[PDB]
Amino acid sequence: AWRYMGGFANNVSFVGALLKGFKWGFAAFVVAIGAEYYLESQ
Amino acid sequence: PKYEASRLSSLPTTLDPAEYDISSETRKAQAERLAIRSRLKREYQLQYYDPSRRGVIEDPALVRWTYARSANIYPNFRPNTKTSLLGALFGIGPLVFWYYVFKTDRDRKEKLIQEGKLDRTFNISY
Amino acid sequence: AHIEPRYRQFPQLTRSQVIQAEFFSATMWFWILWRFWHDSDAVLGHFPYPDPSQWTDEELGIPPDDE
Amino acid sequence: ITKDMLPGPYPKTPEERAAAAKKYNMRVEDYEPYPDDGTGYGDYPKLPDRSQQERDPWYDWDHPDLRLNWGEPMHWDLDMYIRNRVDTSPTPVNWNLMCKHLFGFVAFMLFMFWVGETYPAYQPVGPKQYPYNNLYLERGGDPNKEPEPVVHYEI
Amino acid sequence: GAHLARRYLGDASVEPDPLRMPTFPPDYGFPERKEREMVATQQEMNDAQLVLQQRDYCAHYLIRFLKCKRDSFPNFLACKHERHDWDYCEHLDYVKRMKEFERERRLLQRKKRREQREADM
Amino acid sequence: PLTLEGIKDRVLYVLKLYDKIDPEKLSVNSHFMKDLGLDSLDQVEIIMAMEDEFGFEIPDIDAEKLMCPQEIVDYIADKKDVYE
Amino acid sequence: YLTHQQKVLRLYKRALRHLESWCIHRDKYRYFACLLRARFDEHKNEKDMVKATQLLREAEEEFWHGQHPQPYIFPESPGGTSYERYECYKVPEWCLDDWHPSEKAMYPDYFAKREQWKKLRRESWEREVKQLQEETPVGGPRTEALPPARKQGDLPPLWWHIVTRPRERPM
Amino acid sequence: MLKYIIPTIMLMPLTWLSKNNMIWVNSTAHSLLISFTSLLLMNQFGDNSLNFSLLFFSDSLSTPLLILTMWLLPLMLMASQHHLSKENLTRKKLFITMLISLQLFLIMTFTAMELILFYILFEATLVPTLIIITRWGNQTERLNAGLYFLFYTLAGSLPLLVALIYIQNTVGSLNFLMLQYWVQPVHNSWSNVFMWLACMMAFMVKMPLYGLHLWLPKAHVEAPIAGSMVLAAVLLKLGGYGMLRITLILNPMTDFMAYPFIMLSLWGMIMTSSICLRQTDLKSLIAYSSVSHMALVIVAILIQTPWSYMGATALMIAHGLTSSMLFCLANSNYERIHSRTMILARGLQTLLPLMATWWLLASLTNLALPPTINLIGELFVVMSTFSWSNITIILMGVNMVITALYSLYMLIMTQRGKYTYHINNISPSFTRENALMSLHILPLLLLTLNPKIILGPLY
Amino acid sequence: TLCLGAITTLFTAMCALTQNDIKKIIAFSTSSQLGLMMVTIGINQPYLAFLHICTHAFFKAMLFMCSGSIIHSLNDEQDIRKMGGLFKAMPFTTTALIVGSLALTGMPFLTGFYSKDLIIEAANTSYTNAWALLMTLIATSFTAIYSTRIIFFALLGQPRFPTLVNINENNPLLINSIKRLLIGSLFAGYIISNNIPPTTIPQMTMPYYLKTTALIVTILGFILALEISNMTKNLKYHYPSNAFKFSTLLGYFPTIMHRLAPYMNLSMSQKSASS
Amino acid sequence: SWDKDVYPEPPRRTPAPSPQTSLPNPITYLTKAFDLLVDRPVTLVREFIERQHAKNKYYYYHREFRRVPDITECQEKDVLCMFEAEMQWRRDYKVDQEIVNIIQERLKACQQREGESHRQNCAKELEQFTQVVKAYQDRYHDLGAHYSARKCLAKQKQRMLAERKAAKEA
Amino acid sequence: SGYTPEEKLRLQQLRELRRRWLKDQELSPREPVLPPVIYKTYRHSIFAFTHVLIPVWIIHYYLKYHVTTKPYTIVEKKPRIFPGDTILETGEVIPPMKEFPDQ
Amino acid sequence: KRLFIIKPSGFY
Ligand SMILES: CCCCCCCCCCCCO[C@@H]1O[C@H](CO)[C@@H](O[C@H]2O[C@H](CO)[C@@H](O)[C@H](O)[C@H]2O)[C@H](O)[C@H]1O
Ligand SMILES: CCCCCCCCCCCCO[C@@H]1O[C@H](CO)[C@@H](O[C@H]2O[C@H](CO)[C@@H](O)[C@H](O)[C@H]2O)[C@H](O)[C@H]1O
Ligand SMILES: CCCCCCCCCCCCO[C@@H]1O[C@H](CO)[C@@H](O[C@H]2O[C@H](CO)[C@@H](O)[C@H](O)[C@H]2O)[C@H](O)[C@H]1O
Ligand SMILES: CCCCCCCCCCCCO[C@@H]1O[C@H](CO)[C@@H](O[C@H]2O[C@H](CO)[C@@H](O)[C@H](O)[C@H]2O)[C@H](O)[C@H]1O
Ligand SMILES: *C(=O)CCCCCCCCCCCCC
């Protein structure tokens, strides 16, 4: 039972594993291109 | 699908039909095998555990093995149709085989060199 | 040590390993997205591939049958 | 070791067989010499042609690495059956089936590679064109013999 | 692929042989066919030390790119424009080879067609 | 770093999670057959649970002899050179 | 040398370990482990031993067909990835007898206690030999079993190489 | 050569007039000094040999063999002084005298200008060698080994004597410098076939050629350590050195007469190499390894090319040090367990760490790891036999694989695995033993930095 | 060399599909990747073969280092069937393992993409053995499958390791060493490809289906690998096929060759040569 | 330090720096650091050593071998003349080995120097290598390990006889 | 199928001895009785001096004054020359390429 | 605690 409880209860799925860090990678990416659009625009 | 044993893959002991059909005569033999093994084990352990011993516990089985694998062969060798044919087949045969391989190769090479059809343009090391 | 083993339980984790691991996972995805934004041709195609069936006989120098 | 404890000639009488079995620490019912041809085995026992890897690894062998006990008769080919060399252990797949599948796989692949050479893949393009008479001079061509011209045209 | 199915499964007689093409004269059907111009001289390619397989009809763009790379060091992200000009020239070169293949294919199909016309009397 | 008490606790911990043993009538000297009323198939499963617990194999010739928790503790302490 | 019971219980343990290798997941393994245990339980009370042997033989043929070709092996079991790994670090205790006096001088307490063990071994040996003589039938021992010490102050015969064997993790 | 003959002779009064307890110290020290002076023979010229007098000359072939010979004497005294400790004083001195007299014959043998003088000294080396094996060998079979050694040699060397005397009658001289200029081609005839065989068989038996090699595994298994060292290091090379000289006067008949002996060597080396994989006695295994290495030398000598002659010379020197090392390594185990059985004492790297390093280094040279001179010699032979016939590379390549297998098999079996439980007398390596091993390998590996001095006249 | 590399890359990738020892899966991964380099030699692209050597060095070395991190934390356990549930327990080794697997499978713009994808396009558009080309593409799909196998069984699901938990990847020597190779596994290919001087004329004109073949077969490999992995959770018991046994036992090549050839040679030595 | 005619070298043509970037060249600064930290101290030590050498100038010479009659002028079995002819032949043979080595060295340096243009720009070196190797092969190839001036002369006469025979039938 | 009472007694006695032996392997406190950022840069400063600067001095001295004083010991690939380059040795100016056709 | 490590003599 211990293998299905506590900190082991919820593991990611395979697609969830590949997308580790995608949220912040996307947040940084969006800020980076927006800045680049700004610099080019000037 | 039955197990087919080979020289390099033995029949598993659990699939051996003689493993289960065990008679009182077969249990008697297994007991005698364990008595020989136990008698030798005791003889070994009495020397192995002796605090005053320093050296090698000579093993007659090892001595018999090394003696058999050398000195004991020729005395028990008999020239007959088997050893003579194996003696000829793998003793003279390879020498004759390789002689013709190399002799034929070298005759062909020497004939081309004399006729000037072997390319030795930069061959000055030999 | 500073990490003591646990019995039948999820192990003790430090903040350093979690933060560092996420930063490099986030770094991986930013890099892919950033590269894909500017270099999408490296994945999809650099130049158009023509249809040879749409080349006229005139530009390929194909004379008419009775020539 | 006295000479009575060393290997001797092939045993002929039943009494010799009993003597040989005892010298080799075997039951006379188990002792069996190699067939008496000219080979030269003498009376040395013929034991099962089995690797040491097949012996029980949990038993307390006097020689754990070899899985031998002191005093037990050694197989004639013991040095070929150490655990570093020839294994005869049972296999999960029959020996003959393994040879069929391995050879069949290799033979099939060789056939297809020959097929693939006879019908190669390629793109629908003409030859690559090079200037200066197909780079006649750059490729080491003799500069005193004019090359046969190679002319390329626009399309 | 597609052309390979036609040649190997279909009729090989109307498909180009990549190892023999062209099999028709360059000017056959092409009144006043121009010569391929060459911008880089042999000496320039020799001095630039281009790989022989790079000494093709786009070498002038490769030479321009190579010079930019050496001059822009340590900025290895420069010379993108020069690199694209060389890549684009090679694309046009490849398309010309596609045209040669397609031209050869249609001439073979014409040759066969005339032979049906000739022997159907 | 195993200790004699650590081995004993884990051996009894595993047995207390086995539905066929009453956790209140279990001591380090309880005999699996003569006291807890188990059979040899049950004993084989107990040994397998200990092997998983401590991550090593117990050979069949030795395993069949371990018939109480204390014997298992003694067997494991011997293999692992545990003396305290 | 194996009874019928020993053969059956060895197959049960062996079959479960190969089953676990196929299943992998614990919940899946638990499910099929109970199904396999049921199969052994249906023929638990077979009395006709001819039938019992036939059941064992057929079961072994079934195991051979369905065994995992690459079963799990505990790392330090024979055939495991750590088997014999630390044998190169195991040094026999007699090697300390050849240490230079300056080497022994670095561990004055260890070698003083070592001399006590050597004294204990020396003074126990004659009684160990005698005990084995008087307990061994005429034709030598018939099994490899050894006896305990009988009196107080005696040590079990042939104890030294068991008690002083190298540690499993000697370095 | 008198500057080497006389101090070698003086070693005998030194040993007999030494204090009882200083025979090993004195003989070892002064034979090392003689070895030091032997480096003066390196005064070699590009065109001419070093022609000392009417009796003795040195060239690039004999010089490396001379230096190996004089180096081995102190090494042999080091190796012998332990197993001879119980021997009484007079018999210890007689043993040392036999070693000294062997060196005297050897240095004269390798520098004799006249071939009949070379013959007598070539034969004289049998006497002390036979005495060392039969008198100071350990086992009953040393007497048989002495006989096989004696009669294999004489069966071949007596016909050589007749051939040599016949050549002198026909040519007028046996001086090797004279023969270089008065040599005449050997025409085809049955008389010349047997003249060729008489001129060669004695050297083949010593090498030994495959088929005439059965005396050598016997001699090694029975000889004391010093006997094995000199046998493997130098005495085998008497055949090679003899062949390298006498082939001068056998052309062009060698073109076709060499074929049967090339087949025996080419196939012989694979057989003997394969045999090593199954040997149970460590000395016997090393002995069979020598037959395989020397089969390369026979081929190299018989095909007569500059590359093959350079490779033959390097191989002879390289094998001399390597095989002598291997016997010394095997002997150091014997002095502890008193058995030559390879499988008896295992896992010795756990008990003798530094001795296992010497075992590793010796094995690596035996399998010819580049850039050791063992590999240089083998490679030069492989290059030259490829031109002789491209197919030989298959046989040469297979032997290289088998050589690695049996060399590492010997290392693995004795040094690795688990130690044998009951062998509890493996005492730590002595300074003498460690110094003996390093006095083999260090000059061997140093020669890699200047290989030209062991490449011979064709360099 | 083209055909030698193609059979190697296909055969060893097939073997990796069923291996359970983590070090052996990655070992067979190397053999498969070496075969691809040998294919690149076969299609006359030596500088592409060299580039793959350089890129492969980063993520392959990381993958072994990550596996060593797992093996150490599980007290020298190397069987993936005894791993599981490590995605959160070892977050940094997980990140490195995922990055390394994505670089190996040619995820765009990671270090492995700058060599493998160019190799696949070069092979796709070359005048080449058709069979060798197909074997190479299938082996590319198999790369996705056996990489999925490591991630699925080592990191996801529930723990299958013993009860005394000794997981700990918090040593700076471990973290820093893997960290540097993680940075290389992301950017090294981009940095190298943008600095080396051109020595060929890279083929950049091709149909859409020859340009994206590497990406598609890799994606299909991942999807198919997920179907197989998830089916191991169903409460169904399956008998083994010949294909499964052939893959697990490595085509029987070691079993047949390492018994037969040593037996024949060693038997010749004692029976005929010696005696 | 060496004769430039024996070991020729084309005049080296180095392009001048022509930057097209505002970034500094790290190689330029490392070159300055290397010149300051490595070259200058090394040069100072050498100049000290060269000053000591200039205080003890002494000479060595290249040995000159006068020509002696060759094997063609030696009476059969006249060892005294044969010996001097043979030693001279052996010295010439060693010299001819080094002449081939010089030409091979020229060829190898051209190949590296000319880079990707080596197949065209090294024709003269390749031609010279081909000719000397042919000349060397004629003289010395196939003589065997026990070579001599006698065997070399016999080979030459065999070649001369073949050349005359062909010329006659022509 | 458990221990016989004699097997149990022997194991208990060996177990007592084995545990005593293992305890006696512990070292006493005195054993082994042995016979008689500023820092970080300095550690790396001494290493750079002895393992980079000293070796490079020796190699440069060896290359400059022994190796490069012999023919063909160091052979460089000759520098690439592009249209529009200037030569330092001579001052020669390499002419530019033709005008490119528009593309 | 610290345990004695049995090694062969390293002095020689
Ligand atoms: C050139 C640009 C390159 C890209 C640079 C991108 C930098 C981005 C840095 C982001 C740092 C995020 O740091 C990490 O984020 C994750 C988000 O799940 C947090 O994790 C969070 O969710 C998990 C469960 O999902 C829980 O543990 C908890 O709710 C919280 O910790 C970590 O606690 C935090 O340590
Ligand atoms: C992209 C992949 C490219 C490579 C694909 C290669 C696949 C080719 C496989 C060829 C080898 C098949 O070889 C063949 O297998 C079948 C099934 O076991 C065997 O069939 C036999 O064995 C089985 C099992 O014992 C029994 O049903 C029966 O004895 C018999 O049918 C044949 O005796 C064998 O000749
Ligand atoms: C005119 C023709 C005769 C020429 C004779 C020339 C030499 C004459 C030498 C006479 C002295 C010989 O000396 C005699 O022999 C040896 C060596 O000295 C000595 O005895 C020796 O014993 C042992 C060696 O066996 C050593 O310790 C040491 O060499 C010496 O003490 C005797 O004690 C001595 O009496
Ligand atoms: C081809 C050139 C070289 C040929 C050399 C051949 C000459 C003979 C060499 C050996 C001479 C030894 O002389 C004698 O040989 C026989 C065997 O051969 C030895 O005898 C040995 O073998 C025989 C036969 O198996 C046994 O019966 C005997 O028990 C054993 O000791 C003698 O003890 C030895 O005295
Ligand atoms: C079109 O541009 C070519 C694309 C390449 C297709 C290769 C097909 C491979 C199928 C198996 C080959 C069998 C051997 C003939």
PDB file of C-alpha atoms in Angstrom, chain H residues 4-18 23-24 26-32 34 69-70 72-74 76-77 80 92-109 121 124-125 128-129 132 136 226 230:
ATOM      1  CA  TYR H   4      85.278  -9.428 -22.747  1.00  0.00           C
ATOM      2  CA  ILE H   5      86.661 -12.971 -22.839  1.00  0.00           C
ATOM      3  CA  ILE H   6      89.319 -12.419 -20.163  1.00  0.00           C
ATOM      4  CA  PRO H   7      87.150 -10.635 -17.550  1.00  0.00           C
ATOM      5  CA  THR H   8      84.524 -13.326 -18.141  1.00  0.00           C
ATOM      6  CA  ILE H   9      87.192 -15.943 -17.424  1.00  0.00           C
ATOM      7  CA  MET H  10      88.299 -13.983 -14.349  1.00  0.00           C
ATOM      8  CA  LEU H  11      84.796 -14.412 -12.916  1.00  0.00           C
ATOM      9  CA  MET H  12      85.720 -18.020 -12.121  1.00  0.00           C
ATOM     10  CA  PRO H  13      88.746 -17.347  -9.882  1.00  0.00           C
ATOM     11  CA  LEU H  14      86.668 -14.574  -8.307  1.00  0.00           C
ATOM     12  CA  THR H  15      83.878 -16.990  -7.400  1.00  0.00           C
ATOM     13  CA  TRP H  16      86.231 -19.685  -6.124  1.00  0.00           C
ATOM     14  CA  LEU H  17      88.431 -17.284  -4.119  1.00  0.00           C
ATOM     15  CA  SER H  18      85.561 -15.314  -2.586  1.00  0.00           C
ATOM     16  CA  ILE H  23      79.920 -15.689  -3.703  1.00  0.00           C
ATOM     17  CA  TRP H  24      76.610 -14.230  -4.891  1.00  0.00           C
ATOM     18  CA  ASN H  26      80.894 -10.778  -5.828  1.00  0.00           C
ATOM     19  CA  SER H  27      79.826 -12.701  -8.926  1.00  0.00           C
ATOM     20  CA  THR H  28      76.741 -10.523  -9.383  1.00  0.00           C
ATOM     21  CA  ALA H  29      78.588  -7.221  -8.978  1.00  0.00           C
ATOM     22  CA  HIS H  30      81.422  -7.967 -11.385  1.00  0.00           C
ATOM     23  CA  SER H  31      79.248  -9.568 -14.063  1.00  0.00           C
ATOM     24  CA  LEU H  32      77.206  -6.360 -14.010  1.00  0.00           C
ATOM     25  CA  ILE H  34      81.217  -6.696 -17.576  1.00  0.00           C
ATOM     26  CA  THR H  69      73.987 -12.433 -23.247  1.00  0.00           C
ATOM     27  CA  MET H  70      76.174 -10.493 -20.815  1.00  0.00           C
ATOM     28  CA  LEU H  72      71.513 -12.150 -18.517  1.00  0.00           C
ATOM     29  CA  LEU H  73      74.360 -13.550 -16.410  1.00  0.00           C
ATOM     30  CA  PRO H  74      73.833 -11.270 -13.370  1.00  0.00           C
ATOM     31  CA  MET H  76      70.583 -15.515 -13.659  1.00  0.00           C
ATOM     32  CA  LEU H  77      72.680 -15.284 -10.492  1.00  0.00           C
ATOM     33  CA  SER H  80      69.230 -18.797  -8.713  1.00  0.00           C
ATOM     34  CA  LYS H  92      77.173 -23.603  -5.401  1.00  0.00           C
ATOM     35  CA  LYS H  93      80.489 -22.543  -6.929  1.00  0.00           C
ATOM     36  CA  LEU H  94      80.260 -25.306  -9.527  1.00  0.00           C
ATOM     37  CA  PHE H  95      76.814 -24.023 -10.507  1.00  0.00           C
ATOM     38  CA  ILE H  96      78.107 -20.467 -10.906  1.00  0.00           C
ATOM     39  CA  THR H  97      81.068 -21.819 -12.880  1.00  0.00           C
ATOM     40  CA  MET H  98      78.713 -23.504 -15.349  1.00  0.00           C
ATOM     41  CA  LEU H  99      76.864 -20.214 -15.858  1.00  0.00           C
ATOM     42  CA  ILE H 100      80.138 -18.341 -16.387  1.00  0.00           C
ATOM     43  CA  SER H 101      81.451 -20.936 -18.825  1.00  0.00           C
ATOM     44  CA  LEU H 102      78.162 -20.727 -20.716  1.00  0.00           C
ATOM     45  CA  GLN H 103      78.605 -16.968 -21.129  1.00  0.00           C
ATOM     46  CA  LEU H 104      82.190 -17.407 -22.310  1.00  0.00           C
ATOM     47  CA  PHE H 105      81.110 -19.849 -25.018  1.00  0.00           C
ATOM     48  CA  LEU H 106      78.190 -17.625 -26.022  1.00  0.00           C
ATOM     49  CA  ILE H 107      80.181 -14.422 -26.482  1.00  0.00           C
ATOM     50  CA  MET H 108      82.758 -16.327 -28.527  1.00  0.00           C
ATOM     51  CA  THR H 109      79.983 -18.037 -30.493  1.00  0.00           C
ATOM     52  CA  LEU H 121      81.526 -23.007 -29.582  1.00  0.00           C
ATOM     53  CA  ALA H 124      80.240 -26.365 -26.531  1.00  0.00           C
ATOM     54  CA  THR H 125      77.221 -24.585 -25.042  1.00  0.00           C
ATOM     55  CA  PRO H 128      77.155 -26.731 -19.372  1.00  0.00           C
ATOM     56  CA  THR H 129      73.499 -26.426 -20.380  1.00  0.00           C
ATOM     57  CA  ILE H 132      72.638 -27.409 -15.377  1.00  0.00           C
ATOM     58  CA  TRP H 136      70.275 -29.072 -10.688  1.00  0.00           C
ATOM     59  CA  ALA H 226      68.584 -20.017 -14.632  1.00  0.00           C
ATOM     60  CA  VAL H 230      69.387 -18.789 -20.700  1.00  0.00           C
TER      61      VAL H 230
END
